[PDB]
Design a protein around this nucleic acid. Structure first.
Ligand code: MG
Ligand code: MG
Ligand code: MG
Ligand code: MG
Ligand code: MG
Ligand code: MG
Ligand code: MG
Ligand code: MG
Lengths: 258, 167, 216
RNA sequence: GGCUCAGGACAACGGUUGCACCCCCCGCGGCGGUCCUAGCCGGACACCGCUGGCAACCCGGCGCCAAGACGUGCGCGCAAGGGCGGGCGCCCGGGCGAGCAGCGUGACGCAGCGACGGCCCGCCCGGGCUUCCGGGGCAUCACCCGGUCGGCGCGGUCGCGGCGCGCCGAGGGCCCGACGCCUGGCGGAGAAUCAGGGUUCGACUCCGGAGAGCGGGCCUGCGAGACGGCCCGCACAUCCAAGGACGGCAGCAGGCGCGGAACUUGCCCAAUGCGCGGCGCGCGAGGCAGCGACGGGGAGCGCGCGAGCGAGGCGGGCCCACAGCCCCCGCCGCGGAGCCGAGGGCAAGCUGGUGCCAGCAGCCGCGGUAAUUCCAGCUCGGCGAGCGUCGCGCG
């Protein structure tokens, strides 16, 4: 038993959906605690170095970040291991590039470019309502943020729109049958569909049945069902509309691209 | 040192398990406070640095406490005279050692100074016109550094009166 | 060997001197005396007669220092805590066991630390110079409370480059402005929170609330 | 972080639950009201100067000075704990499957924050315990346990709990193998073997556990019962100007012993990461090189009646933290095959010796004058930069 917390991370023990080469090295970056957890995040350096390719080493990324060249939800971050998560705003003014971090059908993080009109807010999932000091009602979300004095009409598992400049709630979408959702965990990450059924078991998990646009049906637990509007998405989504092709069609697409 | 780990016990079949590691600091214990009634000397309370930087205070000597008469909603700070009954053992009584559940006699002055003029339970009033009132301890000295309680009421009062009357 | 180097220090003028002793019989009166004990200078009548001295320390023939409350003529071992004397720690909670000479004086010593508390009118080879200047505002204000200007002098000392300690505990515009801004911010925060509570309470007219009522 | 696998056989460990019995640094987001000189408070130590002890290790006394150090503390009531506050067969908001949270009110107590403003809350990683299932062999071990099983009460603990103590009762486990003994016993993800079903192993790359000569104890700190931290006993070991002082390679190299068996006392943070930190430092983690027939993969000692190409050497590039190496460009140009066998199993036979001797032979067997089997020469066969012998596992 280790006598304290863990600070390192072996490369082979890192999450698969990070797509890290086996021979890159013994070690992988260890994300620091923040808005998102280890298994539902991706470090900034990976995006800035292994994807966009604006840097070729750790040091270059360190200089870029300490020179204030990236804003996360309107706030400059200088930590190369800062965790980036789902429905986050990634803006680089020096090149006028703005991206929203979402999931691809394969189950990995992707950068969807956005516009100026929709980059002043983000969507958050409310999963906990509790009373704080002095009995004051509170409310928490998936990105580690708390808001005091929420509307009584807002319940758990709902979705909340908040302005980036000011953490004030505008409108909220209820968790109900007939609402477009997006799956954010498990075997079905990145799929988009509409809720058709809700079944609860006393003392255990609650299972949600969803149907895709094409008629396919799939199941997942409520812990990773994210509402993204009322029958139509509230934000811009990837070019594909949450359709996972079968191995045959993916092979055809690969051969075509070959 | 003192520990409460279960590795040094026997199994449900009565077998010797065996030992596979040295002692750990999470599983430690400490010597009892043995809080004493006062009856260089004065109220003495110590402080203990517990896991996580948390602070725990154990009382070694004390003489006063807050007591409540629930039926009439009367509460004052009163001086504790001596311990008269304890279910665990009579040795604690002889030594006047304070623990949760001890039955004690308190001074009647703070209560009689305002009582004996309103209709209430006869028995508490008969105690009030005397020098002491039977009471109980509800806090945990050794963990919070205090000795509070409440005044006995009905069937429990009869139980303890019948217990201590022959003595 | 058989001797003792006596070191004398003068705190009033900051002068210190040392001397040599080759005998014990003359110094028997020094035997049995403890640290912080008056010691008449009559032992060394020539040049030190009619002078009162206080014993402050020493070292035994092996080099072991003398501790205070041991009350012994022989050295001994004890567990020394951090921040105590005759022990230089390494970590922040480390203890160490080492030998120390007993406080009581005896022939076994090889050194003596003594100070001069009262003396006669005679001159002795043994003024106090100052190597540094006071740095805090209160000190200098004392030596050239509720002082509005907060200005000061600068003549100091010079060595060519002029070197003066920087003054501390001085308040000017930056500190005054910073404190005022902080106060204003705290007041604004409290007012905003109170307003939010008031409007939330104004809402919920069709439901129940539970909060800690502000007393006083 | 790195090393190792001694100890430990309803344990560790693997999968599956829970804390409505819990603790948690950095970081992210909030919140921020404090009972009874505030143009800025008080006193010290370190470094340093003078005087000194001792072989060494180690320190002593006097003396002016700083703080985002210590203490005190300006302020709209606020920490822990404690008493009272729901129903009438059950079910049909802050929140739950679940009367759980919060609040009011009567008494106690003034904890924390505050001389450049952080007490507190939530999330996150981590930890602690906990449900269910799996979890070595011996019956020339058949009965075992007596805080052992349960109940009441207190204490201690971050916390539940025979965890500890007092009292009460008697229980709990066992051929569906208890208890005891043994193990040249760390576990799993996995490895070897090969129709299908399986057998054996699992020190070592990832995860988890345990330890730092043996056995114990403790301070600091959010976090250690830590050992490149301290204290003691025991077994070893070192220096001594003999009074005293001092140590822990199962970290990287290297050495002794042991064994059938196992490498340089090399260079560097340039890469991957960690710690601190603004234009950077450090890291025997890690990288580079050296030895290296454990082992795996790819070419070759010729083709042809004359031409051509290798290895190798001398130089230039590329690469490299510096250098090699591979690869590319120019001038000269070292062409080298062994180990087993030839009676059968099992593919492959000619003279000379010796004479049941010397020797061969996994088994059958040969050798007492042709020895197709020994020792030699010729010839021939198998694999091939590899071949053969010994032990173990699978078949
Ligand atoms: Mg006050
Ligand atoms: Mg202070
Ligand atoms: Mg073993
Ligand atoms: Mg390991
Ligand atoms: Mg250890
Ligand atoms: Mg230890
Ligand atoms: Mg070591
Ligand atoms: Mg260590």
């Amino acid at each position: 038993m280790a006598r304290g917390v863990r600070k390192h991370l072996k490369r082979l023990n890192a999450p698969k959906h990070w797509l890290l080469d086996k021979m890159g090295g013994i070690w992988a970056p260890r994300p620091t605690n923040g808005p998102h957890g280890l298994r539902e995040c991706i470090p900034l350096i990976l995006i800035l170095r292994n994807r966009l390719h604006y840097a070729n080493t750790y040091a270059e990324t360190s200089m870029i970040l300490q020179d204030k060249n990236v804003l996360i939800d309107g706030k400059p971050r200088t930590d190369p291991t800062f965790p980036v998560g789902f429905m986050d705003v990634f803006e680089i003014p020096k090149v006028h590039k703005t991206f929203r971090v979402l999931y691809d059908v394969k189950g990995r993080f992707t950068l969807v470019p956005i516009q100026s009109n929709e980059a002043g807010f983000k969507l958050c999932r409310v999963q906990k309502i509790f009373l704080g000091d002095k009995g004051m009602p509170y409310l928490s979300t998936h990105d580690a943020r708390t808001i005091r004095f929420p509307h009584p009409d807002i319940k758990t598992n709902d979705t909340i729109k908040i302005n980036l400049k000011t953490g004030k709630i505008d409108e909220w979408y209820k968790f109900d049958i007939g609402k477009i959702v997006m799956v954010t965990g498990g075997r079905n990450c990145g799929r988009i569909g509409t809720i058709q059924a809700i079944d609860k078991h006393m003392g255990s998990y609650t299972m949600i049945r969803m149907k895709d646009t094409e008629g396919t049906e799939f199941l997942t637990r409520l812990c990773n069902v994210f509402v993204i509007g009322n029958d139509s998405p509230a934000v811009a989504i990837p070019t594909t509309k949450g359709i996972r092709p079968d191995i045959i069609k993916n092979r055809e697409l690969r051969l075509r691209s070959i | 040192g003192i520990t409460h780990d279960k590795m040094y016990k026997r199994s449900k079949t009565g077998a010797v398990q065996g030992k596979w590691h040295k002692k750990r600091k999470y599983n430690l214990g400490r010597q009892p406070a043995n809080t004493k009634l006062i009856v260089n000397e004065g109220q003495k309370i110590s402080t203990i640095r517990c896991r996580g930087g948390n602070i725990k205070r154990r009382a070694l000597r004390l003489s006063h406490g807050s007591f409540a008469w629930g039926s009439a909603d009367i509460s004052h700070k009163a001086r504790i005279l001596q311990v008269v009954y304890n279910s665990t053992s009579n040795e604690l009584v002889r030594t006047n050692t304070l623990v949760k559940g001890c039955v004690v006699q308190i001074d009647s002055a703070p209560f009689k100074s305002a009582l004996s003029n309103d209709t209430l339970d006869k028995e508490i009033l008969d105690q009030i016109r005397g020098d002491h009132i039977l009471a109980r301890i509800s806090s945990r000295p050794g963990q919070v550094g205090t000795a509070d309680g409440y005044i006995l009421e009905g069937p429990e009062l009869l139980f303890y009166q019948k217990k201590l009357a022959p003595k | 060997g058989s001797f003792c180097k006596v070191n004398i220090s003068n705190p009033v003028t900051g002068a210190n001197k040392s001397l040599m002793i080759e005998d014990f019989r003359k110094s028997q009166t020094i035997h049995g005396l403890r640290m912080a004990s008056e010691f008449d200078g009559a032992a060394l009548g020539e040049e030190y007669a009619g002078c009162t001295f206080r014993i402050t320390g020493g070292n035994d023939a092996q080099g072991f220092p003398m501790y205070q409350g041991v009350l012994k003529s022989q050295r001994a071992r004890l567990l020394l805590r951090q921040g105590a004397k005759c022990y230089l720690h390494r970590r922040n909670g480390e203890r160490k066991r080492k030998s120390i000479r007993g406080c009581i004086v005896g022939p076994d010593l090889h050194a003596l630390s003594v100070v001069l508390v009262d003396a006669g009118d005679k001159t002795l080879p043994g003024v106090v110079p100052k190597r540094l200047v006071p740095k805090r505002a209160s000190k200098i204000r004392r030596l050239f409370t509720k002082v509005d200007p907060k200005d000061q002098m600068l003549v100091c000392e010079l060595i060519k480059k002029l070197k003066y300690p920087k003054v501390q505990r001085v308040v000017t515009d930056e500190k005054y402005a910073r404190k005022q801004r902080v106060i204003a911010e705290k007041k604004e925060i409290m007012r905003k929170s109170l307003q939010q509570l008031e409007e939330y309470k104004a809402l919920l007219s069709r439901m129940g609330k539970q909060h800690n009522i502000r007393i006083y």
